[PDB]
Amino acid sequence: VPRGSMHGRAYLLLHRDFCDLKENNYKGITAKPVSEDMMEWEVEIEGLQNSVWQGLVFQLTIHFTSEYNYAPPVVKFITIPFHPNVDPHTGQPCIDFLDNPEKWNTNYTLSSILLALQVMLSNPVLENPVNLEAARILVKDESLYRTILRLFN
């Protein structure tokens, strides 16, 4: 690797963040660097408690950039899920602090992002969903909604 690499801002921040994540040993959350860069991650987040996704698992990839901490990583669903806020075409979750520049915060660490994702992805913003059918079905008969999720698993 290029000399001075192990000295990049993003790399050092993610390095620190990962040690923290490991120390935190958060139940229901797994994240592993899938590159020497520490830029590419593979993550699994269990469905929040007492939520429609109880018992389910969000399998995502998180791509950070050398701008990290000044910029949000890019999160994508490995397999496009039937979800009110996940772009059915991009597999990307509509999350404010991820899509709205004014919402990003340099206080967001790998841990924050993971816990925030868990809560948000388990509590859709029916307001103005990207996936209409998913939201619609969710609204009426959340039991059917679940049935569909299981079918998608």
From Swiss-Prot:
Record has ATP-binding as a keyword: yes
GO terms under biological process: DNA repair; proteasome-mediated ubiquitin-dependent protein catabolic process; protein polyubiquitination
Keyword check for Flavoprotein: no
Molecular function terms, GO-annotated: ATP binding; ubiquitin conjugating enzyme activity
Keywords, in A-Z order: ATP-binding, Nucleotide-binding, Transferase, Ubl conjugation, Ubl conjugation pathway
A cellular-component GO term for this protein: HULC complex
PTM per Swiss-Prot/TrEMBL: Autoubiquitinated in vitro in the presence of UBR5.
Active-site positions on this chain: 94 (glycyl thioester intermediate)
Highest taxon listed in the record's lineage: Eukaryota
Domain UBC core: 9-153
Role description: Catalyzes the covalent attachment of ubiquitin to other proteins.
Family: Belongs to the ubiquitin-conjugating enzyme family.
Entry protein name: Ubiquitin-conjugating enzyme E2 U
Taxonomic source organism: Homo sapiens (Human)
Lineage: Eukaryota, Metazoa, Chordata, Craniata, Vertebrata
Parent sequence residues shown: 1 to 148 of 321
